[PDB]
Design a protein around this ligand. Structure first.
Ligand SMILES: COc1cccc(C(=O)COc2ccc(C[C@@H]3SC(=O)NC3=O)cc2)c1
Ligand SMILES: CCCCCCCCC(=O)O
Length: 259
C-alpha cells in the first residue's frame, strides 16, 4: 500500500519540523529577500565580523571553527531527537543505535548544511547572520579550505531543489544504513531502510513528477557526502597537531574514532 508510505512520509516531515528549528523553507526565505522573514547581517571581512556582535548574539580563525564545532554538537542533539522519532529505531539494539548515529550524524549535518548555503556563503546564528564563502577562504593556513568542499557539494546538491518534506525522508534513509562498521544485527536495520526507501521514492515521484530519476540522483549524492566526511576527518587531525591549544568537544571526539 502506497498509502502507508504516505502516512510514513507525513509522520517524518512532522518530526523533522519538530526537531529542527531552522528548516530549508525558512533559510531560503532569508536568503532570497522574502517578507516572511528578516534580512541577515553579512560578514565578509574582519570589520564586519566584530560588527556582527553589536548586531547578532583568541584568534578569529580559531573562534570561527570552534563555533562550527559548537553548532555541530547542537545539531547532533537535534538529529538524535529526529532519530528516536523514526519508526523502529528505538526498538533496535542499543549498541546499533549508537553505531547508526555515530556514522550517520555528519552525513546529515552536511546534508542540512546545504540548506543554509548558496554559492556565495552560509547562514549562521539561526539565520541572523550570513558569512561569505570568500571571507572563509581568507582565514588561516590550516583553516583555508575547511569549508570549501561543503560549498562545492552544497551547490551541486541544492540543484535538485529538494523540499523539507523530501529531506525528512532522505535524512532517515541515511541513518538506517546497515552497511555501517560494527553493526550487530543488520537485517532489522535493512528492513527499516527498505521501508524508508519506498517512502522516499514515492515522495519524490509525487512532489517532483516532472523530475526524471530524482530518486537515483539523490542516492548518488550519498557518495559525495561520505567523501566530505572522510576529508574533514583528515583535515581535523592536521588542525589538532598545528594547534595544540584548540579544545574539541568530547561528543565530537567520540564520534570521530570512526572509519
Ligand atoms: C560561528 O558559527 C559559524 C561560523 C561560521 C560558519 C558556521 C557554519 O555553521 C559552519 O557550518 C558547519 C560546518 C561544519 C560543521 C561540522 C563540525 S565543525 C568541525 O571542526 N567538526 C564538525 O563535526 C558544522 C557546521 C558557523
Ligand atoms: C564567537 C564564539 C561564541 C560561540 C559561537 C556562538 C554560539 C553562541 C554561544 O556559544 O553562546
Amino acid at each position: 500500500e502506497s498509502a502507508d508510505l504516505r502516512a510514513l512520509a507525513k509522520h517524518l516531515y512532522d518530526s523533522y519540523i519538530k526537531s529542527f528549528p531552522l528548516t530549508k523553507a525558512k533559510a531560503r526565505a532569508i536568503l532570497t529577500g522574502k517578507t516572511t522573514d528578516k534580512s541577515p547581517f553579512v560578514i565578509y571581512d574582519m570589520n564586519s565580523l566584530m560588527m556582527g556582535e553589536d548586531k547578532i548574539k583568541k584568534e578569529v580563525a580559531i573562534r570561527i571553527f570552534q563555533g562550527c564545532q559548537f553548532r555541530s554538537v547542537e545539531a547532533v542533539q537535534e538529529i538524535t531527537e529526529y532519530a528516536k522519532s523514526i519508526p523502529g529505531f528505538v526498538n533496535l539494539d542499543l549498541n546499533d543505535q549508537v553505531t547508526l548515529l555515530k556514522y550517520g550524524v555528519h552525513e546529515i549535518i552536511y546534508t542540512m548544511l546545504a540548506s543554509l548555503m548558496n554559492k556565495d556563503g552560509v547562514l549562521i546564528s539561526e539565520g541572523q547572520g550570513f558569512m561569505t564563502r570568500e571571507f572563509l577562504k581568507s582565514l588561516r593556513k590550516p583553516f583555508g579550505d575547511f569549508m570549501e568542499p561543503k560549498f562545492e557539494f552544497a551547490v551541486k546538491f541544492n540543484a535538485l531543489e529538494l523540499d523539507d518534506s523530501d529531506l525528512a525522508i532522505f535524512i532517515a534513509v541515511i541513518i538506517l544504513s546497515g552497511d555501517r562498521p560494527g553493526l550487530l544485527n543488520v537485517k532489522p536495520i535493512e528492513d527499516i531502510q527498505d521501508n524508508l526507501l519506498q517512502a522516499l521514492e514515492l515522495q519524490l515521484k509525487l512532489n517532483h513528477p516532472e523530475s526524471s530519476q530524482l530518486f537515483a540522483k539523490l542516492l548518488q549524492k550519498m557518495t559525495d557526502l561520505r567523501q566530505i566526511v572522510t576529508e574533514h576527518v583528515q583535515l581535523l587531525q592536521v588542525i589538532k597537531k598545528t594547534e595544540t591549544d584548540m579544545s574539541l568537544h568530547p561528543l565530537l571526539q567520540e564520534i570521530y574514532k570512526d572509519l
